[PDB]
Design a protein around this nucleic acid. Structure first.
Lengths: 465, 478
DNA sequence: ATGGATTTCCTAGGAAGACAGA
DNA sequence: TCTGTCTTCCTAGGAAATCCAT
């Protein structure tokens, strides 16, 4: 946060300057070594803060806060390159160290090579024969003024995880890296990228990346940048699996790693925070999941039936448990079910969810426990465990019993929204607990268009018995 | 019959043989006679070919077709056999001088051959760019040439209407013209054709892109021994570049396939035609496209006449001697509406094709009826009597019109919002009609639970898979 | 033979850029 | 300058080959 150290650096440059002008009528002039050392300190710090920005970008993909801007980083790097410039310029004196110029040049080169970033990441789930965009940024672009004034060219090529550790073809891969004096930025934006074909080398688990290469002239520096890991797909059906992989990699990944290694097993609450974040960001609400939801999720993925939330907390979940092992009694993985719920809730249940009308994540046994002691016509809404992306009405009605209504798909809710569907059922009197349905659903109801012209409108209603 | 005519020519050939071997121990004018009878026969066969093409022309709109070329091929083969035997008998000197005899024989041969090159499988008459289509060309005298012989290759090229009177390019346009001993056929089949782009020819007032007629030209060369070039032209087709154009393109083709003379300058068609011709075309297209033999009735033709002509006349005989123009058909917007006559009609075709197909055949749908005649009919009928009519305001929709008298009983008519094909996909017409308690009788009196009992779908009881209770949706009106 | 992955193929249709309009 | 024609761009699925496996 403190640039004060920089104000120590340039001032030290001042000291060197005046000292040089003192010998204008051998000496030390040891301050150059000193100052250069503090420069390497500054550079290292800015480099690791860059790496921080990168991991923040990584987390942003799953649904987490991001800076997002690089302008401060750019200003810092610019200042460091400034002091570098005046130092190197000051080296020009009669007062002969190969180390001064040699070290300064490696400071410059590491700063430059690390200032080559992927500002706009390509899609982390990528379909072949579909067009996507990516954006690369150079922070020290306006410091090279341009002195050559001739733009380097950045090429983008697809690489496997193996080639990442140091085929498939992409089109319109060459774009010039250009300086923009307004906007203060040195960027290259690939806006018409397309993948013609890829070598596959469990399909939705192979991590690939886009490699942005360039050449930079001064006085021969090769610039390399690697995008976030991405999963290549060839049809929409694979998407639902691909996300999981990406979801796993964007979180749970250390800042420095061999591309692209990630833990096979992780703490359960880490997974809970990941699910909460992804849920809130993807659906688009600030009303996240609750501890009970995490409990009923926990039993679901673990095939357990404990009613104490803390036993699960010290459990660990593996990638296999997450998206490679089939749930008991069912035909899908945990993740597939969860993502199905994500889709349904995003498209048709966002207002309903934010209003807290949906209990959602509950075993129907806890539902029995709750509803059995309730008056006739009390109901609650639960996500269906049998099918993917479905929601079911559970209500209590000869004695007292409870009825589970066939789950609504996104299609079903598109035909008639959940709200008016609920309005249709007069047998439903109160939303759990003890809340009148006609108050908490007045906004979701749509006003009748009775009357023209010149036809009477025919409406569709849901009924069950 | 035509075969008596064939064996008379051939018997004359026998006589020619015996006469020749008699005069080898002078006319011999009988050869001209026989030649005269051959050219007659050839002409007839040619005209029968011209018939087939026209049937094919009609077939594209939806009319019966009898598709094999094998009989025609048999005719042509026997005929060229006769040609060969005449030409062969000509080589007696002579007669013991006349070049003209063989000269006529050779034109018999060449006209027959060039006319034996047909487009058996027609390309789509509505053609989308960058979409794959197929075409099939046939040579009838193919199994005669060759019996050893290098098979020719047929080239397919796109041509405008102007070039037909004598321009995008196609991919994989070369295919060898091959003989097949089984099937007894000499055909060339283009199975991977593609139009990359098209350049649209003309000034376009008042025309529309989608009104411009193009064709595929099939060319070949034949090496016998003598230099005969084979060209065949397909039916006119309209090239499109997006689905929105289809419903208009079709109209053009519909107009062009009918109303076209058997021999014509490509591709001229009458701009105006008798109304009853239009009725026959509309009925045929309806039956073929929907897929029923239950065609239109005089009342339907009356309300259609009123619609397209803007004539509130109630006499079927007035319209009978009227003429309808292309402009009225698909270039003039209907009064009060945003679409042409044809667009509405095609909407109805689509609706009836996808849904209401069984319903129409059961004669449950009157369909083409003015709301005035509806009012006339329904006012007197009992409470809850209804009928189903196609919406004139909307495209591809059908509406229930029913009457409520009450105990007073002042009878008014209630017109229910038209059902789209989508709406019927959500819940069938049958189940929709069942859902409303009020509708008691189909017109005139037929009980609703009798005339729709086959169309009803069985209700599922709340048993559960599952275990769960099913929720179904029903239609209601208020 | 069923079924589950994986991929090239096809298709309608929305959205929006490009093209004229005596 | 604009509107309606025309066109190009682009894409979420549906039908269905290839191939593989305690």
């Amino acid at each position: 946060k403190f640039k004060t150290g920089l104000r120590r650096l340039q001032h030290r440059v001042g000291e060197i300057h005046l000292l040089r002008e003192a010998l204008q009528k051998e000496a030390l002039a040891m301050l150059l070594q000193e100052t250069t050392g503090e420069l390497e300190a500054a550079k290292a710090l800015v480099l690791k803060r860059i790496q921080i920005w990168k991991r923040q970008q990584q987390l942003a993909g799953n649904g987490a806060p991001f800076e997002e801007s690089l302008a401060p980083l750019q200003e810092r790097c610019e200042s460091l390159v400034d002091i570098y410039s005046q130092l190197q310029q000051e080296v020009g004196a009669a007062g002969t160290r190969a180390s001064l110029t040699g070290r300064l040049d490696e400071v410059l080169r590491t700063l430059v090579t690390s200032c080559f970033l992927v500002e706009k990441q390509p899609p982390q789930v990528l379909k072949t024969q579909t067009k996507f965009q990516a954006g690369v940024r150079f922070l020290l672009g306006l410091r090279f003024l341009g002195a050559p004034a001739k733009p380097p060219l950045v090429r983008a090529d697809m690489v496997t995880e193996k080639q990442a550790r140091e085929t498939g073809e992409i089109i319109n891969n060459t774009v010039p890296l250009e300086n923009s004096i307004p906007g203060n930025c040195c960027s290259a934006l690939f806006k018409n990228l397309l993948l013609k074909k890829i070598k596959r080398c469990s399909v939705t688990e192979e991590k690939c990346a886009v490699l942005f290469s360039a050449s930079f002239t001064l006085g021969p520096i090769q610039l390399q940048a690697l995008s976030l890991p991405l999963v290549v797909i060839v049809h929409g059906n694979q998407d639902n699996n691909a996300k999981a992989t990406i979801l796993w990699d964007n979180a749970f990944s250390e800042m420095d790693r061999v591309p692209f290694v990630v833990a096979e097993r992780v703490p359960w609450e880490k997974m809970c925070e990941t699910l909460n974040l992804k849920f809130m960001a993807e659906v688009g609400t600030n009303r996240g999941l609750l501890p009970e939801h995490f409990l009923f999720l926990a039993q679901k993925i673990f095939n357990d039936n404990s009613l104490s939330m803390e036993a699960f907390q010290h459990r660990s979940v593996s990638w296999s448990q997450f998206n490679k092992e089939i749930l008991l009694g069912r035909g899908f993985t945990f993740w597939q079910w969860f993502d199905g719920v994500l889709d349904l809730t995003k498209r048709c249940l966002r207002s309903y969810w934010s209003d807290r009308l949906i209990i959602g994540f509950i075993s129907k046994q806890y539902v029995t426990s709750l509803l059995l002691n309730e008056p006739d016509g009390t109901f609650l809404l639960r996500f269906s465990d049998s099918e993917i992306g479905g929601i079911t009405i559970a209500h209590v009605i000869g004695s007292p019993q409870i009825e589970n209504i066939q789950p609504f798909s996104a299609k079903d809710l598109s035909i008639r929204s959940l709200g008016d569907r609920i309005r249709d059922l007069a047998q439903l009197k109160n939303l759990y607990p003890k809340k009148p349905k006609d108050e908490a659903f007045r906004s979701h109801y749509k006003p009748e268009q009775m009357g023209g012209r010149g036809y009477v409108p025919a409406t569709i209603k849901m009924t069950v018995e």
